[model samples]
Each structure stands twice: as structure tokens, then as C-alpha cells.
Target: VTCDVLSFEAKGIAVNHSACALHCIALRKKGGSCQNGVCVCRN
Candidate 1:
């Protein structure tokens, strides 16, 4: 599997796994997670 940093908002306190996944969803991605303060989207 591969992943990409889909959003930088995860660096903020308002973003986490849930918010990251939601952001990925909005971008038509499968799923996402907050890793190293970044929103990592899995493909």
C-alpha cells in the first residue's frame, strides 16, 4: 500500500484521524490518518 500527505491541516489541533479521513473522503480518497502532524491518505 501507498500513502500521501493529502492535507496539512492535521498539524492543527482541530484535525485528527476522523477529520483527516473526512478530508480524504472529500478528495475522493479511500481513507486517511494523522501521521507526524500530517493528513496521510492511503491509496
Candidate 2:
């Protein structure tokens, strides 16, 4: 596999500066962040 991929989007959901980190822990990602109101997960 070209690396397992997992992605999701939160529509009509409130987001803050720590939104990415929250999602990271929720999704169990090693690390991640958000930009322009979009969550960008790190690989």
C-alpha cells in the first residue's frame, strides 16, 4: 500500500487554534496542525 490514508472534514463545526491538536489526539495522529480553517494532518 502507498501508505494507509485517513482523512476527514468537520463542517459547521467550531474550530480554534488547538483544533488540529485536538483532532490529532482524537484521530491518534503522531502530530498535526490546521491552516486556513482546514485541518492538516502530518504523516
Candidate 3:
């Protein structure tokens, strides 16, 4: 998975200090699987 610079301003959870949660939520919302600090989609 490719990381697009942590959006520090992207808010969401109490533990997502740097858009980490945002990215996770976004990825799941898109039907992708997130694991080990990375997102994976079956191509």
C-alpha cells in the first residue's frame, strides 16, 4: 500500500494522531482491507 503523507489535520479518532484513522476508515469505506499499517485491495 502507498501512503499519501499523513494528513495531520484529518480528524476522526482519538488515537489517529496523523490521519491514520482517517486513512483506515476511508480505505474500509472503499471496500479495501487494511492490515499491518497498510491497505490492500485485490486486483
Candidate 4:
């Protein structure tokens, strides 16, 4: 996985830029977890 491009966040990486497949990433650094398909900066 690549580094966070949002710049405001770290540990989590940006995903699914041009891909059409579903993805799952384990984000514990930002005190949150994503089950959709993208690593977003949120609670």
C-alpha cells in the first residue's frame, strides 16, 4: 500500500484510484476501521 495522499493523515494509505475491484485495509493508526473499499480519513 502507498502512503496517505490526503497529507492530513498518516499510517493509512490511499486506495482504489483507478481500480475496479474491492479492497480492504486494516487501519488502526487513525483509531478507525473501513469495511467499504477505501481508506478514508474519518472517525
Candidate 5:
């Protein structure tokens, strides 16, 4: 995963940019987990 760039966020939470492809990373860090292919902020 090279990190998602076309994703969306709200107060820190976000979803994958490509449904189940890219991962949305935290705005303050580079470590996070994806839920059902959607990455969420870990910071």
C-alpha cells in the first residue's frame, strides 16, 4: 500500500480512496489500519 491520496476524512477518520485498494493514512503519522479495505487514522 503506497498510501491513499484521493480519500476523504472527517476530524481524523477516513475511508479508502479506491474502495478496497488504497489506504488512508493519519494526517499526523504514517501508521494506521484499514477497515474493510478502508484505512483509518492512528494518531
Candidate 6:
């Protein structure tokens, strides 16, 4: 699936869900996942 990179705080408290997807959804994206300390959003 196509994905887009997003920015997230990876040095703070841990989250229960994918912060990437959460941010992606916030931006009106389909969904996303975290990869190598980065937020990748599905496009």
C-alpha cells in the first residue's frame, strides 16, 4: 500500500496505538503505522 511520512514525538511517553495512524487520521488520511521511529501514513 502507498504510504506517506509524518512527524511525531518519539522521545516522550509511549502510546497504546499507532501515533502515525492517529496523526494520519487527524489529517484525513486512511490510516498508517510506525516504522523505524517514523510515522508512515497509508495513502
Best by TM-score: 6
Cα lDDT for residue 38, model 5? Answer: 50
Q: How badly does each model clash, as a count of residue pairs? A: 0, 0, 0, 0, 0, 0
Please give the lDDT score at residue 7 for candidate 6: 41
Model 1: runs farther than 4 Å from truth? 1-17
RMSD of each: 8.9, 11.1, 8.2, 11.1, 9.2, 8.7
Candidate 2 regions exceeding 4 Å error are 1-20
Q: Model 6, 5-41: lDDT tens per residue?
A: 5446767867354555766778889856767666677
TM-scores of all candidate predictions against the true structure: 0.39, 0.34, 0.25, 0.18, 0.29, 0.41
lDDT of each: 0.58, 0.56, 0.47, 0.34, 0.45, 0.61
User: Which residue pairs show backbone clashes in model 6?
Assistant: none
Clashing pairs in 5: none
lDDT of 2 by residue, 1-43 (tens): 1122344475776633455565676786776655665667775
What lDDT is obtained when candidate 3 is compared to the true structure?
Answer: 0.47
Q: For candidate 1, lDDT tens digit of each residue in 1-43?
A: 1234445654556643355566677878875666765567776
For candidate 4, write residues 1-43 as lDDT tens digits.
Answer: 3222243443578633322111222333333333455544433
After superposing candidate 6, which stretches have Cα over 4 Å from the reference? 1-17
TM-score, cand. 2: 0.34
* Residue-by-residue lDDT tens digits, candidate 5, 1-43: 4244554455666633433222333235555555654556554
What value does the lDDT take at residue 3 in candidate 4?
28
RMSD of 3: 8.2
Overlapping backbone residue pairs in candidate 6 total 0
Where's the lowest-lDDT run of ten residues in candidate 3?
Answer: 13-22
